[model samples]
Target: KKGSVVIVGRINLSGDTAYAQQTRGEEGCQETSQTGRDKNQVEGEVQIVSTATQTFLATSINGVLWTVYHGAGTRTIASPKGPVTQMYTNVDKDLVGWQAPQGSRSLTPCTCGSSDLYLVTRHADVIPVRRRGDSTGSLLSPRPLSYLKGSSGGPLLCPAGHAVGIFRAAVCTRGVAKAVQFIPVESLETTM
Candidate 1:
């Protein structure tokens, strides 16, 4: 409840499991196809993204076992609206119709812990992060304890409150908290 309703639950990919485990990144391209896998398995948070032309579910690529799978139907969503009618492969930064705009000089990175969405995070406060790359899909978190697997694919916002990006991973820098990589919210412009 702390994170609002835009965040969703674990996406289930039902159908021919053995087929996915048998092939390469083939299953990732289909819905429970009789072929390979996409990459790895995902067990984290899911976000609902929208724009002037598109609206669908978004999440980290690391969690999805199969990008397109059976039972991938209109899922429940909120914060901005109702459920979504479809889903797609969120490969870190490259989301089909959506792309990242020029890293706005004024656009800041703010993230909420997954535990808060799934349950509740450490600080009700949405910790801020520094943009790590000019083009790379990565951000830096200020706290290490904020690192948790379940919070993967969480939403990123600005001071005004509205999704601008999504968390991909958070690693430790030596001993302290490291880069909390994230994909800026998909943009309509290719490189605006």
Candidate 2:
């Protein structure tokens, strides 16, 4: 809780990421499924919340990381694939992470024996797209984390490909676990 909220950048994607990932950048066009015909190009808006600096934290990848896989309907923050103790917080090195707007990274520590920790990233605010009786589909933490796989990193991209936040950690209860954390960008923007 450092700085107040602020607006930074208007982010968006110029093309299709899924198509690019699937076709390996070869097939730029998506043909009509039923009949082989050129389909109109698909597009969407990618909006990201603005962020400053100062109010956030970052960590470097030291040794290795692992995913603490709990189960389905949960397990949002993915554990690294192998056996590694994921570091979430560290002292001395408060920077070493990426920040927008000011485009600043924390001053790297000059000391050895210092451990690299998980990056506490921030994305823009989570806007609600659909609403129902005080309940709506919000582009927020848990939902975004749940949407991602073990290998996905934050800032969680919106449907239009805008960043949301960093993938922090996971939580579980009664055999159901889901990743939960804050949208750091706002806090960072406000404070830093």
Candidate 3:
């Protein structure tokens, strides 16, 4: 229950727009907008979210802060169990900049010591956020996957699949799991 994970968005109202990177879901839209003034419940949650079909709605989560360490978002959808409808990618500059899968073996930044990173889930399934007495050297921090759960905004991929980051957050020890923080699509940026 505290293993934290999110990647929900399947709106039917407000049209449709799903792009994700920020997690916590704005505290579930502030507890259903403060429990919708208690009882009557005006909106959110059951904004409908059931991972494993086309029943999605995690309405209200429009992100900003692209400077204070970037959090980027836009009403989105990514993964809860597997396969995100059409699979979209937008964080500019080739998804957080960094790619290579056979000839160069890139994904550098820790003086090129702890290489090899992969975690693709949306039913595509590919795991290995890194191992071997791991403390994670930094390809962009926040990693410790004790077999991540729920996988909020899952995307931290790169290994011919392309994607540098966007898993959001996680840290578990009591219930088990110990790392799943992501948001490094090269600090995402957009303007219109």
Candidate 4:
């Protein structure tokens, strides 16, 4: 197994809608109500890129879908199997949930900010991110010098390989991020 875990991104809603309409009556509807039964059900190594405005990424935790809140809108999740369109179900401003698509893998859940976490990059690099505890339910990390621009929605994983938070936004300086903020998984669990 790769040291880094899988992180999936939101697809374009307009494109998803059009595709669904064209394939009407087929089983190609976006977003599944089904959930995985365990954490190791994922198939193969997976990675994706966001292709829409305000798009967010999602990761499953013990059959539950957790994502960073990007605002209220229809978001499409692109998993290793395919795309799953999810309607925003906000538990608060920082957390959201959706049904995990069938066959999608789930990560173990852990307390956020309790230890150092890692962000898996598209290059398959495991970038270490230090957690500075929590502020109003959000996880804090000093802006990572190695952070990628489109990594806002990746999962923050604990040392034990459990997901603890979802990357939100970065406080930027001259187009470079200076500080990073994320929504803790505790909030997502409470919402669930």
**Residue by residue across 80-176, what tens digits does model 2's lDDT show?**
1211122332222121121121221212222232121122223323333221111112222334443332321223333433333333343434433
lDDT of 4 by residue, 1-192 (tens): 101112322221121120101111112221221221112233311223233233234566667665554531344444444445453466455555556656556676775446577664434345576666662122243344445555545567776667777666665667566456777777666666
Per-model TM-score, in order, reads 0.35, 0.27, 0.22, 0.58
Task: Please give, for residues 1-192, the per-residue lDDT of candidate 1 as tens digits.
Answer: 111112222332122110111112222223212121112232323322222222233433222211111112222222112222233433344333211111111222224422111111211124555444531223334455334433343444443443445444455565454455545544312222
Off by over 4 Å in 3: 1-48, 51-148, 154-176, 184-186, 190-192
Give me the candidate number with maximum TM-score. 4
CA lDDT of each candidate? Answer: 0.31, 0.24, 0.31, 0.47
Ranking by lDDT: 4, 3, 1, 2
Of candidate 2, the 10-residue stretch with the lowest lDDT total is: 71-80
Residue-level lDDT of model 3, residues 85-137, one tens digit each, is 21223444222111111111222222223346554443334466652222221
Candidate with more favorable, higher TM-score: 1 or 3: 1
Model 3 TM-score, all chains together: 0.22
lDDT of 2: 0.24
What C-alpha lDDT, on a 0 to 100 scale, does residue 127 get in candidate 3? 60
Cα error, candidate 3, residue 84 (Å):
13
Off by over 4 Å in 4: 1-56, 76-88, 91-94, 135-147
